[PDB]
Structure formats: structure tokens, C-alpha cells
Amino acid sequence: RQRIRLLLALLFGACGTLAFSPYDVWPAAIISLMGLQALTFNRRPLQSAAIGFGWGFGLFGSGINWVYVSIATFGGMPGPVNIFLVVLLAAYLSLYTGLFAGVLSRLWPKTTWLRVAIAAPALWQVTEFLRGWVLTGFPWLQFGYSQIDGPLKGLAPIMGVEAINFLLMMVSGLLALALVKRNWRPLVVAVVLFALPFPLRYIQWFTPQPEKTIQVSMVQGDIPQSLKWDEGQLLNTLKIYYNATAPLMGKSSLIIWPESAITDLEINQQPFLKVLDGELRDKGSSLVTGIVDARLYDTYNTIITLGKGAPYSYESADRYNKNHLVPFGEFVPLESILRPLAPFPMSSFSRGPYIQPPLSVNGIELTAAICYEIILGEQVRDNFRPDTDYLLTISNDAWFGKSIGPWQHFQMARMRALELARPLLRSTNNGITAVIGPQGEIQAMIPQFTREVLTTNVTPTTGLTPYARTGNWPLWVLTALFGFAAVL
Ligand SMILES: CCCCCCCS[C@@H]1O[C@H](CO)[C@@H](O)[C@H](O)[C@H]1O
Ligand SMILES: CCCCCCCS[C@@H]1O[C@H](CO)[C@@H](O)[C@H](O)[C@H]1O
């Protein structure tokens, strides 16, 4: 009955994964969650917390193993070592689901509406907050993101994605209750609470501005990862990108190269950047591109700016530096010939400012975020400005090809657009390159694993959202209310 349960927690946990992309099955989030809620019924604190652990291990285990595809091909570690690192990651994250189920069974032992719809959402908010906070965090696989093409999307520009996580744990809980006690009362309250925001799906917190419509192009280079940083790749890369960029120079007002597309130091690319900038300002176009900067011996993962209304200068401020690093790591991959020899000294990154002004470019304001940073809703929100015309993010997702990793990243990126009511310009090396609407919709997209340019028209938008104005604290107030009430 119990062991049968645990096998079950693993199963409902892995059922969690199918809510996210590329599966896009959003009710699987509810099923997964009420799986957790219901399976934690009728058991002692510890056994329960172990069930929570098994649930989390189902989820993260089925859902972020793609980290392997990175560390195994590009770390070079034995093999069993890699698999160990992955299973350890999943398990570590499942400590949190266990802390959730733990404190839940300890402080609220009986199968009630109190437990499923008042305790669990507040507790889950704090345990997920922790999961995303401790050790710089890893807020990956939050069920709210499944609602991006789904109803409930309305909540996000009001109180953010975490409010959708809240509402989903609540609703799923009441369904768990309704189910195991065969009582229609929790079911009814579930359906009501789930359906209240459906009309929020149609509020437009923003105003289109067709007068500022432009042609945008994003060059998807598709430099193979293994080579990407070889001294003998550099020029084929600069040629690939320059030549993709050249026939658009009179027609596309704005062009983006993805993360560290220019795979060399800025100061070592001064002549190329100056000529490119000169040709750009002549033809009337603008460029935004990834590149690396070693400043005086601090090394920054960087976006720089060139072209019309944005003349290049190594001393310009119109630049962005990546803020969020993995608690270890973020180095520059070595030369191919040097990667097998390493186990038998790399350059690591320094952090850019938590708050960095928009990039200015051709009279466009761009709130930038590099790669992973686009999943940090709060940080993006803080860097966001009322005058911001677009969200910018550039990434290299080639570390995990063909995995679900890229699609999960993409999905979470859409939520920034929805949250802040701005279009999102998403440029990738081989990853998912796309233009996302001010409501998280995918306006334009190009296939991955292709060398290709995305070219389309984009219309920026203005005006704040409740979530733009407030950020997290209304949901935090709701949480504190719920939790302090939850101590009865
Ligand atoms: C014909 C129905 C007979 C069963 C009535 C009470 C069964 S027992 C009850 O059932 C719940 C769901 O199975 C469990 O979660 C709970 O721990 C258990 O005590
Ligand atoms: C500051 C450095 C300026 C360098 C000027 C080089 C411009 S070369 C470039 O050549 C292309 C070849 O077809 C022409 O189509 C394009 O119009 C011209 O801008």
C-alpha cells in the first residue's frame, strides 16, 4: 500500500514533465500535483517527506536529465561520474519536495481542505522559493509555465508565474481531496477557483505602436559547439555571421547575433567591430551581438552594440553583462585539442550588475538578459523599464541538442513576454530562435539545428502591468496571510 505508493510518487512526478514543452499537455500539471497531494495522505511526517522526495525524483529525474548531455560531452568526466552528477542533481532538488511534504505532514496531519488548499500553497511557495534561491538557485520545472498557451495565463501579468504555481497547487489539492473523500464540495470549489481567471485571458495591459514597427533579423549561426571556441573556427564564424547579415543591411532596421557569437575578446576584435559598425551606420542598420570582454583581469559574458543610432566603442555604456552565474562554473570552453587533456587552467566569469539599463539601439530600448537569465522573472522585471520597447535574450542552447532542455528554456522565456506585455526577441546559436508577442504567443519561429536567419516585422508596446509595478510582494502578502492562518 505504501511501497505501491512510492512507485506511484515516481510515476506522478514523471507525469509532471509532460506539462512542459515539447509536450505542452497542461492538465498533466494538475494530475502530477494532485498525485503529490493525494499520495501524501494518511502517513507519518517522515514517510510522507520520503514520498515527496520520490515525487520530485520522478519529476526532475524525468525532466532535467538533459544536463547530462552537457557535462558528458563537454565536461569530459569518466561516465559513471556524469550519471552520478545528474542523479545527484535531481535528488538534491527533490530534497525540496521532501521538505514540502515533510513540514506539510508535520504541521497539518489530517486529510482536509485546510491542508490541501491553504497550507500546501503557502508551503510550496516557500519551498520552491528556496529551491530557486539557495546556492543561487535552480527554479526549473515550475508548473505555471505549462499555462502559457492555456487558460489561467491571465494571472501572469497581474501577479506573475508564481501565482499560477500557487493556484495550481491549490486547485490540484482540492481535486485530491474531492477524489479521495468522494466529496463534490472540494471539487466545486476547485472548478470555481480554476475558472475565475479565464476572463483575465483577454485583458490587454498594453498598446500596440504600429508607428514603430520595424524589420528585425536574428542570425542563427549554428556553429558546432565542439569547434565554437577553436582559434581556427573564429574567422569562419565571423564570415558566416557577416555574410548572413550583409544582404539585410538596408532592409532590416535591427539585427541580432546570439550568445558570444563573436567567439573572441572584444579588444582583440576592434578592427572587425569598427569596420562592421562603419558599414552599418552607412547602410542605416543596427547590430546587437554576443561576444566576450576581458576588462582591467575580469572576464564578462557580454552583449555589445553597433550601427545606426548606436556607434560602436569599447568604451561605450550601451552594453550588457551577464549577471547570473551557476554557483560554480561559467568558464570559456577550451580549445578542442585541449579538452581531452584537461583532467591530466580556464578563464571563469565575473558578474555584471544586477540592474543594467536597457541597450539603446536605432532609437530602440532593449531590456536584455543572457541565456539562462531569461527564466528569472524577478530579475528581468527589475531590469525592465516603462520605456523599454522590447525584451532581448540571446542564448547558446547547443550544449543539449535534441533534448527537451532547449524547449523548456524557450517556454519559460515566453512567460517574460506575457508577464511584462512586451514582445520578446529570442536569438540563438542553434537553439530555438523566435519572436514572441506581448502575450507570450509565438509570433515567428525558425527550426533548430539549421544555419538560418529569422526575418520578420515587429511592433513594440508600452504601458505597465500590475506585475511590472509590484513584482512579487502581493503574492507574498497572500502567502503570509495563508501561512499564518495555516498555523491553527
Ligand atoms: C468501497 C470503498 C471502501 C473504502 C472506504 C475507506 C477506505 S480507507 C482510506 O482510503 C483513501 C483513499 O484510498 C486513503 O488515502 C486513506 O489513507 C485510507 O484510510
Ligand atoms: C569603416 C569601414 C568601412 C568599410 C566599407 C566597406 C563597404 S563594403 C559593402 O560592400 C558590399 C559588396 O557588395 C556592398 O553591397 C555594400 O553596399 C557595401 O556597404
Numbering used by the authors: 9 to 304, 310 to 357, 361 to 504
Give the authors' words.
Lnt catalyses the transfer of the acyl lipid chain from the sn-1 position of a phosphoglycerol lipid-donor to the α-amine group of the N-terminal, DAG-modified cysteine residue of the apolipoprotein, completing the formation of a mature triacylated lipoprotein. Using an in vitro assay, it was shown that Lnt uses a ping-pong mechanism, including slow formation of acyl-enzyme intermediate (that is, the first step) and rapid N-acyl transferring to the apolipoprotein (the second step).
Unlike most reported soluble nitrilase proteins forming homo-dimers or oligomers, Ec-Lnt exists in a monomer form in our crystal structure as well as in detergent solubilized form in solution. Together, TMs 1−7 and TM8 form the TM domain, with both the N- and C-termini located on the cytosolic side. Furthermore, the Nit domain is partially docked into the TM domain, bringing the catalytic C387 residue close to the lipid bilayer. Consequently, the main body of the Nit domain, the loop-5, α5-6, the lid loop and TMs 3–5 from the TM domain form a dome-shaped cavity (∼2,000 Å3) in the vicinity of the catalytic C387. The cavity maintains an opening that faces the lipid bilayer. This interfacial opening is likely to serve as the entry for both the donor- and acceptor-substrates to gain access to the catalytic site from the lipid bilayer.
